[PDB]
Symmetry: C2
Subunit: 177 residues, 2 copies
């Protein structure tokens, strides 16, 4: 439980810089034990993407209750995606292609997209909404985020996702009209 996300953290770190025997050891436990959590290396890579996705949602559910204004929530969620990709180069090169189990990656994206989609919806919900389809908008914002994460990896990490974010945000805000 608290130990599974422990095998997943150790996994993300190993990717960063597998071997189920070294990983099991990493977390004071044995292969037999580790395999009782993740019987296949395929299942834990899935759980790893899922772990990222859940962790990412947990960070977003925090924004949605600190900030009530839609533009502010957006600003932070986008900053979370950028910042996450920047802090986790290894994981971000997997979500960006440069590394199947891609249905699970794509699920993670459709997922972050639906959280964006509703933050944009909860705007008309109390303003009975945007002049643009929130589906078109959510996907327009995610495309940027996804494009910034895809540079970074490309430029051999010369371009950091959160560089000049204060100069960029305005460009995105101009799309929320």
């Amino acid at each position: 439980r608290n130990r599974r996300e422990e095998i997943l953290q150790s996994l993300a770190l190993m990717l960063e810089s597998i071997t189920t025997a070294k990983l099991a050891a990493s977390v004071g436990v044995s292969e037999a034990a580790l395999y009782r959590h993740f019987p296949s290396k395929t299942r834990m890579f899935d759980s790893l993407i899922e772990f990222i996705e859940d962790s990412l949602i947990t960070r977003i559910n925090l924004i949605l209750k600190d900030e009530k204004d839609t533009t502010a929530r957006l600003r932070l969620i986008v900053l979370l995606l950028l910042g996450f990709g920047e802090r986790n180069p290894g994981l971000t090169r997997i979500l960006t292609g440069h590394a199947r189990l891609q249905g699970r990656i794509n699920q993670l994206f459709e997922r972050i997209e639906a959280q964006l989609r509703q933050v944009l919806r909860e705007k008309r919900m109390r303003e009975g909404g945007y002049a643009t389809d929130e589906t078109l908008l959510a996907s327009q914002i995610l495309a940027f985020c996804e494009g910034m994460l895809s540079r970074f990896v490309r430029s051999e990490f010369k371009y950091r996702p959160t560089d000049d974010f204060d100069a960029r945000w305005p460009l995105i805000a101009a799309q929320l009209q």
Copy 2:
């Protein structure tokens, strides 16, 4: 010359759906001959990316002289990138990661970025310019394009880059103030 881009077209098609013996045959010529153009499979994959990049610039140099207005030039160049990725799924999965020689891919991107960067520059050149660094802007537009190309591949081609472009362009135009 006209025959090299012929080996490169046949290459792009084969990727779409190698083997230097089948490729050579493809173009009524022999391996010996083909190898005198591209001695290494590494050199022609490079020439293939370059071929894409040059072809892409050729299409842009056309826009720059049909349309004189900056927003119109932009609209089309972005539509060319989207449309290109949509017409060439195979090549676009290589530029998107899902396929080293990545310094050459990245060069292609920095390249399309510098063409964007100057179309934005040639705006102040006769209006002595945008309220945003054209470098920040060019890279903001390319990020979107790159993000749309990265979906497409992801969604197993459910999301086409040029879908709803007429509803999206406005969102980008709002970033040119």
